[PDB]
Amino acid sequence: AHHHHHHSKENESLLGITADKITSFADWYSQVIVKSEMIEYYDISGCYILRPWSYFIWETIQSVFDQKIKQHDVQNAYFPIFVTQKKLETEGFSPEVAWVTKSGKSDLAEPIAIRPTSETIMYPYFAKWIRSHRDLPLKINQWTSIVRWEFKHPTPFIRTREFLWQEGHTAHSTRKEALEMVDIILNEYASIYEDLLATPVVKGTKSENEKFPGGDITKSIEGFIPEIGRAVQAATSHLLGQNFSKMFGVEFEDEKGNKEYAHQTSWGLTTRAIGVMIMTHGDNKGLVLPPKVAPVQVIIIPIIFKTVITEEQKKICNEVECILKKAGVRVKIDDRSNYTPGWKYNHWEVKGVCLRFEVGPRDIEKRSVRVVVRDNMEKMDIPISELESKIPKLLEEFQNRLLFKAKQRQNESIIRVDTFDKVMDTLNQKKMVIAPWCEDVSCEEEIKKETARLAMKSLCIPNDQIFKIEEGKTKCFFCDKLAKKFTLFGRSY
């Protein structure tokens, strides 16, 4: 679905994308993020430079999500990047901890860990701040970078040794209020991917074998990349319960005067969202960005070459730019006489600009503009007097079309299998499995073991159970136990 629309002579250049998205996905992903000036590879493995074209999308994700959690009285703070070994020791993987072992030429007697997550940093101070039920709920969030020495092969955005993320940590007086906070954040995470990034995700609950061992319930949104047949956890929201409050002493005096441990939640979203969004919408021409996160929604390209644009040509472009600026549209004019219009067309197509305006003599004469849509090569002529109304509608239609097309690609990637004899062939088709499952830890341990023999794991137990179980008859697709619900399975990042 990547190489359907018309490619121009400049799209077939080396300044375009030469690797096919389906048959050469890894090379396609690298060319798309590099040639669009999103990412620069760094001489330290697993780290990638976030150029402004990609960092804008994170700033938009950060701006939109920060306003969302402020609706629930979540306050932003910043805790140090460092944490002692004693606090950190008591998905914690010791080989992932980046340790500062020297300052200058002086060795540290006790090395200091770089923050892989802030439970150890923050919770000793949650216990210090929380003495009464009146002090609850406490809701803290921080935007910061995280360093984890990932053992698996790094992927830009998806899995980086340094990534930018948001981590919210809340404490409540009741488990019910905490679980409501877990579901609230999960819906906002799903909104970030679907409403902002036009990326479909599946809301659900992690299995006992796949949940965060430090919490009671781990809910998540699962994404999927069909071109490689691997799911990707889009975000996560944990019902920590009292596991962390018991071990850090975060207790409060409830009403009537009894000491009770706090009911905590924690949730996180990283720059991985950008990578999942890129892989979802990008085609063989390069980036395809949702209008809500595209750094430039409209590029105005006057038909000029070598010489300077005429005075009436610059006046029309400024008028169109003024109309689009007043309408809240992010718009820029590319009046570089240095490049042919075809060069600019491919240049802003690789960068994923939603709409391009071609302004030539015929457009000046009619007081109209030639609009070319990025993702489907749709062409139309809009009068200048209609731009204020039509362009916000086109970007709105653009956003809906990306989510709708990405949705039907995800729905066709979910295959129902009721017996294990059809699971392996479904996985080999680069697709997920929705199967009747008993949800036992022992069952998933053998599911991972048997599928690794030809590994498949539970992605999430979806909140929306589209299929029904026979009360007392529907057995697990793998073992002899009765199936509880249907669970989404597949290989993941």
Ligand X SMILES: O=C(C[C@H]1NCCC[C@@H]1O)Cn1cnc2cc(Br)c(Cl)cc2c1=O
Ligand Y SMILES: Nc1ncnc2c1ncn2[C@@H]1O[C@H](COP(=O)(O)OP(=O)(O)NP(=O)(O)O)[C@@H](O)[C@H]1O
- Binding stretches for ligand Y (CB under 6 A): 91, 148, 150, 159-160, 163, 233-236, 268, 270, 272
Whole-number minimum distance, CB 235 to ligand Y, in Å? 6
With binding defined as CB under 6 A, does residue 358 bind ligand X? no
Q: How far, CA to CA in Å, does 431 sit from each of 339, 415, 421?
A: 43, 7, 16
* 431's tokens: 């697709």
Residue 489 Cβ, how far from ligand Y at the closest point, in Å?
A: 16
Which entry of ligand Y, ligand X, Zn ion, none binds 92, CB below 5 to 8 A by partner kind?
ligand X
Beta bridge partners of 492: 231
Round to whole Å and give the CA distance between 84 and 445: 35
**Rounded-to-integer distance, Cα 185 and Cα 180, Å:** 9
Kindly tell me the sign of the dihedral angle through the C-alpha atoms of 133, 130, 141, 262. negative
Report yes or no: 87 and 121 within 8 Å, Cβ to Cβ.
Answer: yes
In the range 283-342, which residues lie near ligand X by CB under 6 A?
none
Amino acid of residue 282: G
- Mark out the alpha helices in 36-79 (DSSP H runs): 52-70
- Closest residue by Cα to residue 313 from 385, 361, 368, 371: 361
Q: Which candidate, 439, 453, 404, places its Cα nearest to that of 208? A: 439
Footprint of ligand X on 194-213 (CB under 6 A): 212
Given the complex with ligand X, which of 110 and 365 has the nearer CB atom? 110
Paired tokens of 363 = 């457009």
Question: What proportions of the chain, in percent to the nearest 5, are helix, strand and coil?
Answer: 35, 30, 35
Site string for ligand X, 213-252 (x = CB under 6 A): -----------------------x----------------
Residue 212 or 489: which CB sits closer to ligand X? Answer: 212
Contact 165, 262 (CB under 8 A): no
Residue 167 interacting with ligand X (CB under 6 A): yes
Partner touching 476 among ligand X, Zn ion, ligand Y, none, CB below 5 to 8 Å by kind: Zn ion
Q: Which does 235 bind (CB under 5 to 8 A by kind): Zn ion, ligand X, ligand Y, none?
A: ligand Y
Task: Look at residues 200, 236, 240 and name the one whose alpha carbon lies nearest to residue 219.
Answer: 236
DSSP character at residue 193: I
**Which residue is closest to ligand X by CB?**
268
Which DSSP category does 109 fall into?
Answer: E
Residue 233 contacts which entry, Zn ion, ligand X, ligand Y, none (Cβ below 5-8 A, type-dependent)? ligand Y
β pairing state of 39-41 and 75-76: unpaired
| C-beta closer to ligand Y: residue 46 or 436 | 46
What radius of gyration do the chain's Cα atoms show?
26
**Closest distance to ligand Y from the beta carbon of 486 (Å):** 22
Binding mask 110-139 for ligand X (x = CB under 6 A): ------xx-x--------------------
Helix, strand, or coil (residue 54) = helix
Cβ pair 321, 388 in contact under 8 A: no
Q: Does 97 bind ligand X (CB under 6 A)?
A: yes
Query: What does 163 interact with, of ligand Y, Zn ion, ligand X, none (CB < 5 to 8 A by kind)?
Result: ligand Y
Query: Does residue 323 contact residue 387 with C-beta atoms inside 8 Å?
Result: yes
Size of the site for ligand X (CB under 6 A): 16
Q: Which helix (H) or strand (E) holds 33?
A: helix 25-35
Positions in the binding site for Zn ion (CB under 5 A): 438, 443, 476, 478-479, 481
SS3 category, 322: helix
**Closer to ligand X by Cβ: residue 93 or 129:** 93
Nearer residue to ligand X within complex by CB, 180 or 450: 180
Q: Which does 167 bind (CB under 5 to 8 A by kind): ligand Y, Zn ion, ligand X, none?
A: ligand X
Residues 46 and 343: their CA atoms lie apart, in Å, by: 33
Pick from Zn ion, ligand Y, ligand X, none: which does 58 bind, CB < 5 to 8 A by kind? none
- Contact between 268 and ligand X by CB under 6 A: the answer reads yes
The least CB distance from residue 264 to ligand Y, in Å, is 15
The nearest distance, CB 92 to ligand X, in angstroms, is 4
Provide the minimum distance between the beta carbon of 274 and ligand X in the complex, in angstroms, as a whole number. Answer: 17
In the list 6, 86, 91, 306, the residue contacting ligand X (rule: CB under 6 A) is 91
Q: Which residues bind ligand X (CB under 6 A)?
A: 88, 91-93, 96-97, 116-117, 119, 148, 167, 212, 236, 266-268
